[PDB]
Amino acid sequence: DESADIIYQFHSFEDIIQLSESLQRIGITGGTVYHYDGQYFLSLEDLGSHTAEGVVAVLAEYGNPTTLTIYRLQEYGKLIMDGNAVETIQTHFS
């Protein structure tokens, strides 16, 4: 695929609350959130290349792409929101 899996690192959950609204505007409604090593990770899978770029532009304002792999987060991290992150958050903070 030229389809993209995107995992970003955020110092706090607040970063994911704030960007959540920007993601939904550009048609992103899912995402999985992990907690690991004192930080939050948002994972988004199977993005077309255009939205992948739109998405990386939102996330870059609040966090950094990560070196950690999806195996490490899943196996050793803590699953916070399983596949529905942007809409679970928007329920509350919108």
Method: X-ray
Report the CATH number at residue 23: 3.30.70.1950
Beta carbons of 42 and 10 less than 8 angstroms apart: yes
> What's the CA dihedral at 2, 88, 74, 43 to 10 degrees?
30
Query: In terms of residue numbers, what domain contains 86?
Result: 1-94
> Which stretches of 1-94 are DSSP H helices?
13-25, 49-59, 70-76, 85-93
- Starting from the edge strand earliest in sequence, which strands make up the sheet with 4-10, in order? 64-65, 4-10, 39-47, 32-36, 78-81
Quote the number of domains for the chain: 1
